[PDB]
Amino acid sequence: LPDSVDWREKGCVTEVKYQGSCGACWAFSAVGALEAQLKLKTGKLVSLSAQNLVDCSTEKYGNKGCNGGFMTTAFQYIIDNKGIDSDASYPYKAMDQKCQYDSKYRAATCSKYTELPYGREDVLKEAVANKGPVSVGVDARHPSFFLYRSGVYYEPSCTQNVNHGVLVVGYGDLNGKEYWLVKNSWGHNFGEEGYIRMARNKGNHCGIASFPSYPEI
Numbered sequence: 001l002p003d004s005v006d007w008r009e010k011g012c013v014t015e016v017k018y019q020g021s022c023g024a025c026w027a028f029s030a031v032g033a034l035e036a037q038l039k040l041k042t043g044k045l046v047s048l049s050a051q052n053l054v055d056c057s058t059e060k061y062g063n064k065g066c067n068g069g070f071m072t073t074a075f076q077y078i079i080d081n082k083g084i085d086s087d088a089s090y091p092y093k094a095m096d097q098k099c100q101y102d103s104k105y106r107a108a109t110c111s112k113y114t115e116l117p118y119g120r121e122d123v124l125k126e127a128v129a130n131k132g133p134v135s136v137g138v139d140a141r142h143p144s145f146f147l148y149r150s151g152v153y154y155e156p157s158c159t160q161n162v163n164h165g166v167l168v169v170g171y172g173d174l175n176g177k178e179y180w181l182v183k184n185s186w187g188h189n190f191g192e193e194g195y196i197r198m199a200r201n202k203g204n205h206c207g208i209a210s211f212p213s214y215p216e217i
């Protein structure tokens with residue numbers, strides 16, 4: 001496997017989004033992963049509708065819109081629904097709404113998704129290198145995460161109890177300090193212009209490899 005990977009260099013990552021006061025991190029993580037597969041399949045980079053997931057991948061998928069959800073069940077909704085609309089056609093409003101999905105605005109489909117084995121950072125590395133960005137849950141419930149500005153994030157009090165959905169779009173090292181390159185959905189003012197480099201091969205730091213999954217088309 002390559003020592004470092006950055007899917008942004010491969011044109012498979014869209015602009016960083018701002019979820020606002022709506023807890024739709026799970027929806028942003030899911031569309032983010034599917035956006036890369038869509039680019040790999042069609043050659044086009046298009047932001048997909050996180051709102052579509054918030055409003056439609058609801059109770060039947062164990063999700064609660066702005067109150068939380070799962071990337072895996074979000075992928076299953078897209079599969080069952082036979083599509084997800086473009087973000088342009090179904091914009092994000094940072095609030096729960098009645099489902100407004102319309103197949104006339106479909107921008108992607110999904111045929112399946114894969115959940116990686118719990119806590120295996122080596123397996124996660126292989127997936128990021130060979131398949132594409134991977135949706136993951138992390139424990140972001142610590143002040144240091146909110147205050148992160150730059151460098152490799154390491155929090156001694158981090159746990160494997162995850163609560164925030166994000167997207168691993170690469171991996172590498174900062175002068176030896178290995179990290180996972182993570183796209184967040186807290187806007188471009190968060191961390192490294194929307195990204196955070198989280199400690200890699202540090203005993204499943206913040207549970208980054210606890211629940212990884214990626215979709216395919």
Ligand SMILES: *C(#N)[C]([C]O[C]C1=[C][C]=[C][C]=[C]1)[N]C(=O)[C]([C][C]([C])[C])[N]C(=O)N1[C][C]O[C][C]1
Pocket residue numbers: 022023024025026062063064067068069070071136137138139140141142162163164165
């Ligand atoms: C996102 N956004 C939400 C809310 O995140 C809370 C938070 C905020 C700041 C720092 C740390 C955490 N999270 C979720 O949607 C998570 C994602 C999952 C992969 C861990 N899911 C969630 O909270 N659920 C609770 C309700 O049932 C569905 C899942």
